[PDB]
Design a protein around this nucleic acid. Structure first.
Lengths: 129, 218, 88, 18
RNA sequence: GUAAAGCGCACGCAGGCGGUUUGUUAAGUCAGAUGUGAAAUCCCCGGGCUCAACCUGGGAACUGCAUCUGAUACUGGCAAGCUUGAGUCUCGUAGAGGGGGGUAGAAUUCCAGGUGUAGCGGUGAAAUGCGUAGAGAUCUGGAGGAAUACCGGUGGCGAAGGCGGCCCCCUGGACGAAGACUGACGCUCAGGUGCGAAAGCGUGGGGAGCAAACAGGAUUAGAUACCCUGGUAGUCCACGCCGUAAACGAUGUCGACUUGGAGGUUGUGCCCUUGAGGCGUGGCUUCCGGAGCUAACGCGUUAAGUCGACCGCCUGGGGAGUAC
């Protein structure tokens, strides 16, 4: 999007899933791909692949275990306009741990299970659930 | 090469995008169903019908449309089974106690309406009641045998009787529909991307279903 | 307004080569050519308000390209606005 | 009317359209 | 949107946000550490008052600040780019988009002429009115002012207000076909600036109809109203002001995503365009409609859906958009 290229991808993921699409496409980033790894390895989505040189477009292959989607509700938290940063202990829990958060830690982007084990807080990218 | 490779499609331009994938892609201003992809949910429905008949399937042959009507009554009889070859009377599933008393009334017609005209009060008035409520028994021709609550359901369309599926899913009965392409397949249970017109086709479908159900008891 | 050759010469001398319409100084001087032409119009009518909207639109885009010159490369800025007399 | 006639010709298009 | 609440509309400084790759810094951020965060209060495990309130030991806590050492993903800086964001050029398409000039004819009115004549008008009946002089009616002309029948449309254009005869002069946008070129040049914008229907005002013209005000005639219980006969300001023009509207899609601008159908208007690509078009692709546009949203009606790819960036406003009715 013109001012939030990451809430834009999240909106892609949970618009193209109300419509029940198999796969969605968007112009990729480095942070977009860094997220996509954390999504696709916590099983929130099948697998992705980025492709393109002048216009490297990210395409996620959405997942769903029934008519229901596996991704219930992703929430963009650290909006440009209100940047949200947390410490290693005040890291949010999503659905009391059932769902995943995505934070930008000094050692990269990861979940909060792993960034709470790693003892290193971050920048709350989005709640994944 | 078979039935699937014989009937093609429907739905010139007023199409329903809920069953988007079921079509190859429209040719000659009409949509064409993925006819080859229909047999994997032919044989599965056939196998489950065999299983249900093994449990003595209580299975409906909903035939509300004009042409399939006698084309299905023949089936249920050759199916030794039930049907509704006429209008889906509003609530023949949810309002079951009503039709329960109604079939009591019809059994009364076939037992005592003969007995009433015999000697009870009048000759001619009882004959009038006979010639009128024979139309009542003409209604409800299929369901008339057993206590109700059929195991499953084999409606032959969706749009024409969206109320039928709307009641069977609200009650939890497996709808074995043969969706048109004009229809709204979100409600059905075992949707079959077939073509509901071309009475030849529906006769073929019901003949296959009859062949399955007549010995699903193994 | 402005003619095809009138814009052609601007693209010619103010572009780094032929068909360098896009460089910001070509755009700036082409816009200022058009503005200088239209002052003679708007001094005649004074009741044409549905054209001072366009004149203001291009004066605003000229200032917006000029600030971009200023940040991106100062030397071209300070060599242009005297070739034009611009940034009074 | 100077303002109705553009309204009836844009209302009765509810009357006489169907 | 309709409950209170989107400025009338734009432009725009400050401000707020910012595509993408690499390098750098390490300010935000994060981790650790060091000091400090008075005591009592608060909490915890105690202890002593016969219990408790109360007193009390030790801890925890004081969610802060400052300094130091690491990380470097994200945000910021600085540098180098990139092309998708935004903009220039080639090229055409449409249009009541503006501004300035003329110009035509019908129509009301007035004036002059001819013919000849007793009514004309007016309403629910009526008089005031106009007229025997020549009215009405008719045709013949002439003056003036104001608007542009038909096309015309659920049409089109414009930021809104708004813009309809025709032709020219200047001009503003928009959209579409391929291209080329800059390289983030962007979005929003408190204040600010400018446009702002109609009334209204100022100074000079003009003034056909129409007509607040004002006269006279009916109505009514009364009529200062509806109704009729006159009718001035105004309506028109130039310059200046006013700044408001139910200025309304009662929907701020910008961007991204998300099933379908039928129309409309304007480009264009391919197809025997044979043609009308078929197959496509753009833009703008009106009407249905499940998802979804809504209190609801309803909206529904032009959202009131799912998100993001900014701005404006709301916080029971009255008093009051009033006093100062």
């Amino acid at each position: 999007s013109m001012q939030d290229p990451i809430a834009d991808m999240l909106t892609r993921i949970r618009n193209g899933q109300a419509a029940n699409k198999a796969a969605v496409t968007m112009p990729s980033s480095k942070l977009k791909v860094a997220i996509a790894n954390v999504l696709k390895e916590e099983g929130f989505i099948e697998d992705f692949k980025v492709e393109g040189d002048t216009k490297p477009e990210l395409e996620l292959t959405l997942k769903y275990f029934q008519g229901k989607a596996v991704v219930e509700s992703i929430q963009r938290v650290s909006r440009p306009g209100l940047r949200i940063y947390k410490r290693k202990d005040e890291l949010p829990k999503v659905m009391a741990g059932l769902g995943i958060a995505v934070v930008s830690t000094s050692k990269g982007v990861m979940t909060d299970r792993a960034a709470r084990q790693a003892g290193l807080g971050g920048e709350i990218i989005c709640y994944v659930a | 090469m078979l039935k699937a490779g014989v009937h093609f499609g429907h739905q010139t331009r007023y199409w329903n995008p809920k069953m988007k994938p079921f079509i190859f892609g429209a040719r000659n201003k009409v949509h064409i169903i993925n006819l080859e992809k229909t047999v994997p949910m032919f044989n599965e429905a056939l196998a489950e019908l065999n299983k249900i008949a093994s449990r003595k399937g209580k299975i409906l042959f909903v035939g509300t449309k004009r042409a399939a009507s006698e084309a299905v009554k023949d089936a249920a009889l050759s199916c030794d089974q039930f049907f509704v070859n006429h209008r889906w009377l509003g609530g023949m599933l949810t309002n079951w106690k009503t039709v329960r008393q109604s079939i009591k009334r019809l059994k009364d017609l076939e037992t005592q309406s003969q007995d009433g005209t015999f000697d009870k009060l009048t000759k001619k008035e009882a004959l009038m009641r006979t010639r009128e409520l024979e139309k009542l028994e003409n209604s409800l021709g299929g369901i008339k045998d057993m206590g109700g609550l059929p195991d499953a359901l084999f409606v032959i369309d969706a749009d024409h009787e969206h109320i039928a599926i709307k009641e069977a899913n609200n009650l939890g009965i497996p709808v074995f529909a043969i969706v048109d392409t004009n229809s709204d397949p979100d409600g059905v249970d075992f949707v079959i991307p077939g073509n509901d017109d071309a009475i030849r086709a529906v006769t073929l479908y019901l003949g296959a279903v009859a062949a399955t159900v007549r010995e699903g008891r193994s | 307004s402005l003619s095809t050759e009138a814009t052609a010469k601007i693209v010619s001398e103010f572009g780094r080569d032929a068909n360098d319409t896009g460089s910001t100084e070509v755009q700036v001087a082409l816009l200022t050519a058009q503005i200088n032409h239209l002052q003679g119009h708007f001094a005649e009518h004074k009741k044409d308000h549905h054209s001072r909207r366009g004149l203001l639109r291009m004066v605003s885009q000229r200032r917006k390209l000029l600030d971009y010159l200023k940040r991106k490369d100062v030397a071209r800025y300070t060599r242009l606005i005297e070739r034009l007399g611009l940034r009074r | 009317f100077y303002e109705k006639p553009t309204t009836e010709r844009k209302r009765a298009k509810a009357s006489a359209v169907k």
